[PDB]
Design a protein around this ligand. Structure first.
Ligand code: SF4
Ligand code: SF4
Ligand code: SF4
Ligand code: SF4
Ligand code: FES
Ligand SMILES: [Mg+2]
Ligand SMILES: [Zn+2]
Lengths: 125, 54, 115, 86, 48, 117, 96, 690, 208
């Protein structure tokens, strides 16, 4: 049979994550903005979760870039904002949510290029 | 190798001679080819037994 | 209702009984661990560490989470009893080579950017 | 003891903030010209509740709720704040 | 190489060196890039 | 076709072949290559950092397949054991010295295989 | 084209040299700083400019498929030379 | 209503009349290939990559320029469409140079990606390629014309968005080229956007050249602080270093562009930075020291003095968190002398009402007005994106624009009334034809710049402008919620400071010269040591070495806007937050953390310990600062007008003159852009062509 | 279409579809979906309660006889309410065929051990528990198989970092190997490779 729990989901004690990387982290739930160098929109369909940027310093040897936080590369993918919120909440991380930005529809008119009295007329093609 | 430059890299002379070959070489060695979504279990008769990849 | 199924326990009372049984087993085992692994700690230190490990997650109210925690504790006890573990594994519970990390605002401000 | 600033947090279209809205629309100008050198900061709350903040010397401040108050009530409590009482 | 000599280049070493690890001629690595952030230099003259 | 110690090559005039396209850095399966670049004083596209961690490298030869100008190669040398770990972290000067040291053999090896590539 | 620094350290083609204050110079004590002797900028500056009789010229770096990708260079600017973006060789049209 | 039904691959879509085939296709999530079509630019139709097959139609149509018709069945993946794409890509690649390994566009190239996704995988072109000569159009945009695919995107952007007609085509057929036909630098406050719009490596960033590849960079989304527009941006970083700045689309604000100072002055952050605490030694020279020593000296001098003696000045790049922390710290000392360099009139309502000092109409509201009056403002340089929105409304909505001030060039034709401020009174009293013009306008806007409030008679000016707005609201009645009254700010920290209760201006310092001064990023040079008594203690907290640093006794290094999660308030009143891209260099710290640590040392410790607690404090002081995209607020124009009509100071007989008269004075305005070498190159290029 | 494109076998596709219909008819209590891929692989989606009956039927039925467990593993999809996907790969020697059985679970719900059905499953279940944290009920001896003794976390989860949280080194003062928080001389460099242009129209999702 069933037991009918009435608590809130909390799996933090089972994930093995150190206490520092649970309470002091702030994840961001957002849809990435389109790269302004390209017109494609295929990279703005899903939701992303990433952690706050921590310190990076120069290696004394070779001058490479060193890090001390293990979550500097972790990025998750979600179908909806609610799924990401649920994941972050059950993992114990505090989060910020940014609402999805959509380009508003525009009214395009090729004939407006040659208007008789409007300022839309184009001097060159 | 398969004569499909969107999967297999072109020859070096083609990459250094024609535009399409250079573009495909660049993209295959930086991003790599995209594989359509799906899942397979493929198994061969390896010398130690059945060797498979899901 | 929430329509959930258990692992072992139906409510928190059975889970607490399992926790007490695991605590008894670990408390009994500590002196043998000190003898077999040739640890330089005392039995009191080992039992204090066991109590601290138990208290680290004393805030859990989900019986399923408590059940899984007890299963993991039994796994660790089985590793300790059979000597699969080595002296380094036992001594990792004490963090002997880690310098203390200060917790007040001023020291954190002095050392670096991390909050 | 020495008042330095007055802050009112009233929401734009909540029913409970109607009294504070009416007070600001009617009697705020008179209070402002009566105290031409007193900062009375009007700011907007979210859906929680209305409030009024009063700041004194050396960083001391306390807040009084204005929920469901009418214009008369908010004028009353505000002029209690602007005198050496409460 | 007697019958088939290699191509001559101005940059090819004229003197071969063997494995110099463990000697004072051993290679020591270092960063080959310049400074990233330049600091502000305070003025050298008094202010009052 | 043997894959050995890495080297950086030059054109017959002495100008470097590498143009900082970073294809080798992108394709490297071990993330063993680190590159930085900027316009040279004469406007050329050249690197300021070209490091290969040889204790990260798996010697797969992907970098020399990806290179479009044959700038980075795996040369025939295989006897380069060291006495310290730091001697196996190559920077650009070390790789250019290796290229100048082994070019006479590297060019002949390339002449014998480029028709299979 | 190696020139020495005030501390005696050789200056690399990239221009990196340790400052007097810097402690990292200790790694070169009882050892040496590896510096390549052939500055490619000075070597490519030595090459003569080719003169051709067309507005467009092609460069592949020499050696056919052993050079760089083949590119075409415009030579209309009379007060300049066309430079290959891969090789650095220069071309021009006969003037004066 | 008037929606019609069309089918994209057999799926029914209801669309408005005049909708193009491309828009109908994207209504169901299918993006058509494109090179010359940009949704914010005029349709060209030249590339021919968007050709698709309509069912039962023998000829393919250009999806970017063809209006959909009822009952049409677009076939985006048919054989004819695919073959058209392959042929067009083949023609595009025939003359393209083999430049990908040396091209900065490589890895983020539309030509590359669309060749991979819609073209063939090999070539059958067996001829020689063309090669065109390069052009010089300034120190900002690198030009390599051989890569040009003749999209004509740059020409259309220059004509329509930037208002500059310097770009065009010369010659015909294969020989046709894009350029200026003469040596002329395409210099504009928005010129750097042609790099983004160009789909190939023909136009690229010159400061960015050869430094990074797109797959390497890590993207951080934050806000621009170089003005009060608050443009949304993306910070590209690699291995702990800022590489470049890119626009991030925000329809209400910037939309898809950023100004050249926003794009190119990031190099300023790299040089002249404060990295360690500094104090004065025996010889009066600044000497490196630890955090503890400097904090102890500042705390001692802060405990030594109380009340009016302690004072502070906030600069142009300060965030809300640090402002509220400094305000709390000085309030604990019983000080109220917390001031900003930018002056706002304090008469009447002053800072009490939020509407008095904000752009009430908002940036997106410019697209609805038909008459806008600008007084003492140079929008093109002060708020380039706001000027761009004004030009967009001028072009697409026939917006009528009038200016009061010196006849600056705004890139669009406006009506010049004059520069004498008497015209303000003539319009207010109804004795001006433009008063009648405003009377008849349905959605009028009046915009007064903050640069005209810097004069001695600026307060009177505010009253005069307000009188005009009252007359408009009276004669034209109430249109509902239109908010004719507006103020255009040029400083990123000004509105947040005003919200916090900071005293606008700096006159309180002059009338009560203090002994302990706090310079929070104040580099405007408004107060020297002449205006202060001798042996005065001056503390500077900032990130750069500029006007305010060498005059201080203790230096506390802070973090720039790329190195912290900070709150900034827009001219409209919208509150936006930044994100950490790279940590502060050396020993520099977060500003609010520095102030909180100093408060702990001085004994008057502040309650908040984490950033969330500081933002809770910000909510306590002003709740609008934690609503991170809200821009709607109540309007109290009537009360402000009442309180503003009781003081009658006279105007000045000095024509209004904008601080930046010409383009050269646009580039270097603040601490970061003064340390930028790219901005210096731009200034040199505009002052002399060569 | 001839030289470079993989050939498709229609006869095999028909047989697998018919057998999937057969299995779905016989066990309606547990089968939620039956699928056959275009490269001829058959999948069966079941309810977690039917793990044992379905596997037993597929092993013991005369028309099935999948007597060998080829592979058993898990896949983590964090966007799903049931995080984990359990995949069984079975091979039939009698009929020279392969089949795949799938089910789902979350972090707190155990799955029945399939050890009684297959002897081979004992190690696979241990690996699933070690790498993902999925608990299997009635396992003969469930414990870590691949990770170090006392290792904390489940490394195959998407949320777990690639380099982990701790490293090992030898310490001379305590004269043993010690564990400390990971610090890296060179941080792993994250690449953003995905193209902003769609690759495969046949898999396009509705725009919601
Ligand atoms: S051989 Fe392979 S692993 Fe080594 S550097 Fe080249 S690409 Fe990287
Ligand atoms: S070595 Fe070759 S592949 Fe690597 S950056 Fe240089 S030119 Fe590109
Ligand atoms: S712009 Fe042309 S040369 Fe540059 S990466 Fe794209 S296709 Fe290659
Ligand atoms: S420079 Fe760029 S935007 Fe202008 S025509 Fe050429 S490809 Fe198009
Ligand atoms: S996008 Fe339609 S012709 Fe260019
Ligand atoms: Mg471009
Ligand atoms: Zn060349």
């Amino acid at each position: 049979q069933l037991i009918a729990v009435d608590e809130k989901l909390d799996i933090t004690t089972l994930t093995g994550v150190p206490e520092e990387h649970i309470k002091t982290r702030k994840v961001r739930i957002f849809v990435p903005a389109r790269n302004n160098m390209q017109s494609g929109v295929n990279n703005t369909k899903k939701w992303k979760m990433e952690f706050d940027t921590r310190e990076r310093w120069e290696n004394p040897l070779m001058g490479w870039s060193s890090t001390a936080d293990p979550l500097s590369n972790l990025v998750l993918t979600f179908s909806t904002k609610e799924d990401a919120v649920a994941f972050a909440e059950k993992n114990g991380w505090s989060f910020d949510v940014e609402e999805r930005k959509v380009p508003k529809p525009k009214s395009k008119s090729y004939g407006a290029n040659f208007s008789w009295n409007k300022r839309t007329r184009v001097s060159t093609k | 190798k398969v004569d499909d430059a969107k999967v297999s890299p072109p020859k070096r002379a083609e990459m250094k001679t024609s535009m399409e070959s250079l573009i495909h070489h660049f993209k295959l060695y930086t991003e790599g080819y995209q594989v359509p979504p799906g899942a397979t279990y493929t198994a061969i008769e390896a010398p130690k037994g059945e060797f498979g990849v899901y | 209702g929430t329509s959930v199924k258990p692992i072992f326990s139906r409510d928190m009372n059975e889970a607490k009984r399992r926790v007490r049984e695991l605590y008894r087993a670990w408390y009994r085992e500590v002196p043998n661990t000190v003898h077999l692994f040739q640890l330089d700690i005392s039995v009191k230190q080992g039992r204090d560490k066991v109590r601290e490990m138990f208290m680290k997650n004393a805030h859990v109210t989900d019986p399923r989470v408590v059940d899984l925690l007890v299963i993991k504790g039994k796994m660790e006890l089985e590793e300790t009893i059979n000597v699969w573990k080595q002296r380094t594994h036992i001594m990792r519970f004490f963090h002997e080579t880690e310098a203390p990390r200060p917790t007040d605002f001023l020291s954190k401000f002095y050392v670096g950017h991390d909050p | 003891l020495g008042l330095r600033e007055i802050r009112i947090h009233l929401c734009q279209r909540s029913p409970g903030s109607q009294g504070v809205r009416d007070f600001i629309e009617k009697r705020y100008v008179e209070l402002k010209k009566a105290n031409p050198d007193l900062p009375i900061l009007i700011r907007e709350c979210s859906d929680v509740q209305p409030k009024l903040w009063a700041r004194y010397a050396f960083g001391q401040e306390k807040n009084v709720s204005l929920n469901n108050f009418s214009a008369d009530q908010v004028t009353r409590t505000l002029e209690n704040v602007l005198s050496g009482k409460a | 190489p007697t019958t088939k000599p290699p191509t001559a280049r101005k940059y090819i070493w004229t003197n071969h060196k063997f494995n110099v690890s463990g000697t004072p001629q051993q290679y020591v690595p270092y960063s080959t890039t310049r400074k990233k952030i330049q600091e502000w230099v305070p003025p050298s003259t008094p202010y009052k | 076709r043997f894959r050995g110690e890495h080297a950086l090559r030059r054109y017959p005039s002495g100008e470097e072949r590498c143009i900082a396209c970073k294809l080798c850095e992108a394709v490297c399966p071990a993330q063993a290559i680190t590159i930085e670049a900027e316009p040279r004083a004469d406007g050329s596209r050249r690197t300021t950092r070209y490091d290969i961690d040889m204790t990260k490298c798996i010697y797969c030869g992907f970098c020399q397949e990806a290179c479009p100008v044959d700038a980075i190669v795996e040369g025939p040398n295989f006897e380069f054991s060291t006495e310290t770990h730091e001697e196996l972290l190559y920077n650009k000067e070390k790789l250019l010295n290796n290229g100048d040291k082994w070019e006479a053999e590297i060019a002949a090896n390339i002449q014998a295989d480029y028709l299979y590539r | 084209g190696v020139r020495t620094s005030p501390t005696g350290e050789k200056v690399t083609h990239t221009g990196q040299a340790y400052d007097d204050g810097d402690y990292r110079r200790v790694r070169f004590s009882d050892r040496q700083k590896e510096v390549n002797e052939n500055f490619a900028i000075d070597l490519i500056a030595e090459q003569p400019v080719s003169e051709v009789g067309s507005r467009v010229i092609s460069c592949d770096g020499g050696g056919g498929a052993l050079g760089h990708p083949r590119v075409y260079i415009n030579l209309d600017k009379e007060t300049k030379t066309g430079t290959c973006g891969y090789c650095g060789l220069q071309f021009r049209q006969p003037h004066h | 209503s008037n929606l019609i039904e069309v089918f994209v691959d057999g799926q029914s879509v209801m669309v408005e009349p005049g909708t193009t085939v491309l828009q109908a296709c994207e209504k169901v999530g299918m993006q058509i290939p494109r090179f010359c079509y940009h949704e914010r630019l005029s349709v060209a139709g030249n590339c021919r990559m968007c050709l698709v097959e309509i069912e039962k139609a023998p000829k393919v149509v250009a999806a970017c320029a063809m209006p959909v018709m009822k009952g049409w069945n677009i076939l985006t993946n048919s054989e004819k469409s695919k073959k058209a794409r392959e042929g067009v890509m083949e023609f595009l690649l025939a003359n393209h140079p083999l430049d990908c390994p040396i091209c900065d566009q490589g890895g983020e190239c539309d030509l590359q990606d669309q060749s991979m996704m819609f073209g063939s995988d090999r070539s059958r072109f067996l001829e020689g390629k063309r090669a065109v000569e390069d052009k010089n159009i300034g120190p900002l945009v690198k030009t390599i014309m051989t890569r040009c695919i003749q999209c004509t995107r740059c020409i259309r952007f220059a004509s329509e968005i930037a208002g500059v007609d310097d770009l065009g085509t010369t010659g015909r057929g294969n020989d046709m080229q894009v350029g200026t036909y003469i040596e002329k630098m395409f210099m504009s406050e928005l010129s750097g956007n042609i790099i983004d719009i160009c789909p190939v490596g023909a136009l690229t960033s010159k400061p960015y050249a050869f430094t990074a590849r797109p797959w390497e960079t890590r993207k951080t989304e934050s806000i621009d602080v170089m003005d009060a527009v608050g443009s949304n941006i993306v910070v590209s970083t690699r291995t702990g270093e800022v590489m470049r700045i890119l626009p991030r689309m925000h329809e209400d604000i910037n939309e898809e562009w950023i100004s050249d100072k926003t794009r190119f002055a990031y190099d300023g952050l790299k040089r002249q930075r404060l990295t360690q605490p500094m104090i004065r030694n025996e010889k009066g020279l600044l000497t490196y020291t630890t955090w503890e020593d400097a904090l102890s000296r500042v705390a001692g001098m802060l405990q030594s003095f109380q009340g009016n003696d302690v004072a502070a000045i906030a600069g142009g790049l300060v965030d809300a968190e640090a402002l509220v922390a400094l305000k709390d710290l000085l309030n604990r000392v019983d000080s109220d002398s917390l001031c900003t360099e930018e002056v706002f009139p304090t008469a009447g309502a002053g800072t009490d009402l939020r509407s008095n000092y904000l752009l009430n109409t908002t940036i997106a509201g410019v697209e609805e007005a038909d008459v806008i009056l600008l007084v003492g403002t140079n929008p093109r340089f002060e708020a380039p994106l706001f000027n761009a929105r004004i030009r967009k409304s001028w072009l697409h909505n026939d917006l009528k624009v009038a200016l009061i001030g010196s006849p600056v060039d705004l890139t669009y034709r406006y009506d010049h009334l004059g520069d004498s401020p008497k015209i303000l009174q003539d319009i207010a009293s109804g004795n001006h034809p433009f008063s009648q013009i405003l009377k008849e306008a349905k959605k009028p806007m009046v915009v007064l710049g903050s640069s005209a409030l810097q004069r001695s008679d600026g307060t009177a000016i505010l009253a005069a402008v307000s009188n005009i707005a009252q007359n408009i609201r009276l004669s034209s009645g109430v249109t509902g919620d239109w908010k004719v009254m507006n103020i255009l700010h040029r400083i990123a920290s000004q509105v947040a400071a005003l919200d916090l209760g900071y005293k606008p201006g700096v006159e309180a310092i002059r009338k009560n010269p203090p002994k302990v001064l706090f310079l929070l990023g104040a580099d405007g040079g408004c107060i020297t040591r002449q205006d202060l008594p001798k042996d005065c203690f001056i503390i500077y907290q900032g990130h750069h070495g500029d006007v305010g640093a060498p005059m201080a006794d203790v230096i506390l290094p802070g973090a720039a806007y790329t190195e912290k999660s900070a709150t900034y308030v827009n001219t409209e009143g919208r509150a936006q937050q930044t994100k950490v891209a790279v940590t502060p260099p050396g020993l520099a710290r977060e500003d609010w953390k520095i102030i909180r640590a100093l408060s702990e040392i001085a004994g008057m410790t502040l309650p908040y310990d984490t950033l969330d607690q500081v933002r809770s404090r910000l909510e306590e002081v002003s709740p609008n600062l934690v609503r991170y995209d809200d821009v709607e607020g109540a309007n109290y124009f009537q009360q402000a007008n009442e309180l503003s009509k009781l003081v009658n100071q006279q105007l000045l007989a000095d024509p209004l003159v904008p601080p930046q008269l010409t383009i050269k004075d646009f580039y270097m305005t603040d601490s970061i852009s003064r340390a930028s070498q790219t901005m210096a190159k731009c200034v040199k290029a505009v002052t002399e062509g060569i | 279409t001839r030289p470079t494109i993989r050939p498709r076998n229609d006869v095999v596709h028909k047989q697998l579809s018919a057998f999937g219909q057969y299995v779905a008819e016989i066990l309606p209590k547990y089968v939620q979906q039956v699928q056959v891929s275009c490269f001829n692989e058959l999948e069966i989606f079941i309810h977690p309660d039917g793990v044992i009956p379905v596997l037993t039927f597929l092993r013991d039925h005369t028309n099935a006889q999948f007597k060998s467990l080829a592979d058993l593993t898990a896949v983590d999809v964090p966007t799903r309410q049931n995080r984990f996907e359990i995949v069984y790969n079975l091979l039939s020697l009698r009929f020279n065929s392969r089949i795949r059985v799938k089910t789902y679970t979350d972090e707190l719900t155990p799955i029945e051990s399939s050890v009684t059905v297959y002897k081979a499953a004992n190690w696979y279940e241990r690996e699933i528990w070690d790498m993902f944290g999925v608990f299997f009920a009635n396992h003969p001896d469930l414990r870590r198989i691949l990770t170090d003794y006392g290792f904390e976390g489940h490394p195959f989860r998407k949320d777990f970092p690639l380099s982990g949280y701790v490293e090992l080194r030898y310490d001379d003062e305590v004269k043993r190997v010690v564990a400390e928080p990971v610090e890296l001389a060179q941080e792993f460099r994250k690449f953003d490779l995905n193209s902003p242009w769609e690759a495969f129209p046949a898999y396009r999702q509705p725009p919601e």
